[PDB]
């Protein structure tokens, strides 16, 4: 499902279906428009983890677990430059709401049937 | 350079850490409890709050002050 997360992240990047920022995510949950969510767990935070699934696991919310903050940040491309090597300075992101409108693809039905059960 | 007249510095906004702690109250139950009054203006969304003064609240870029 990692390649499904990769293709839905590149779909969000190519269709502007991403709203990076946890207060933008809180606004998305408050405006009743959240479809897919990505969660970061077992990372370096004393009190942030309790608030992040407290404000994530409300209703009709998918659960994706990421081991490290920086690996999701490198994946989402906060500073995606210099592809002949590595990105220079990317911080670790934790939560993002994928408000994508692109639906007709290959792995979209697969990830929707995986998350429907 | 250093002139004769003094100059007031610009409004350097102090960084406040863990602000997402101070928006909702979390209990054993999963139901949230907002601590700030919500702005009903259509220019801003339903996720925004109001400012926390000591007499009455204050909206965001709407700049609308509501009394009691
Ligand atoms: Zn407003």
From Swiss-Prot, chain A:
Its main location: cytoplasm. GO terms for biological process: positive regulation of canonical Wnt signaling pathway; ribosomal small subunit biogenesis; translation. Gene3D superfamilies: 3.30.1330.30. It is found in: Cytoplasm; Nucleus, Nucleolus. GO terms for molecular function: structural constituent of ribosome. It comes from the Eukaryota. Keywords: Acetylation, Cytoplasm, Nucleus, Ribonucleoprotein, Ribosomal protein. Belongs to the eukaryotic ribosomal protein eS12 family. Part of the small subunit (SSU) processome, composed of more than 70 proteins and the RNA chaperone small nucleolar RNA (snoRNA) U3. Subunit of the 40S ribosomal complex. This is Small ribosomal subunit protein eS12. It comes from Oryctolagus cuniculus (Rabbit). The gene is RPS12.
Swiss-Prot record, chain B:
A zinc finger (C4-type) spans 39-62. Coiled coil: none annotated. It comes from the Eukaryota. The modification N6-acetyllysine is found at residues 22, 31. Monoubiquitinated at Lys-25 and Lys-31 by RNF25 in response to ribosome collisions (ribosome stalling): ubiquitination promotes subsequent activation of RNF14, leading to EEF1A1 ubiquitination and degradation and rescue of stalled ribosomes. Deubiquitination at Lys-31 by USP16 is required for maturation of the 40S ribosomal complex. There is a cross-link at residues 25, 31 (Glycyl lysine isopeptide (Lys-Gly) (interchain with G-Cter in ubiquitin)). Residues 1-13 are annotated as: Disordered. Component of the 40S subunit of the ribosome. Part of the small subunit (SSU) processome, first precursor of the small eukaryotic ribosomal subunit. During the assembly of the SSU processome in the nucleolus, many ribosome biogenesis factors, an RNA chaperone and ribosomal proteins associate with the nascent pre-rRNA and work in concert to generate RNA folding, modifications, rearrangements and cleavage as well as targeted degradation of pre-ribosomal RNA by the RNA exosome. This is Small ribosomal subunit protein eS31. It comes from Oryctolagus cuniculus (Rabbit). The chain holds residues 83 to 150 of 156 of the full protein.
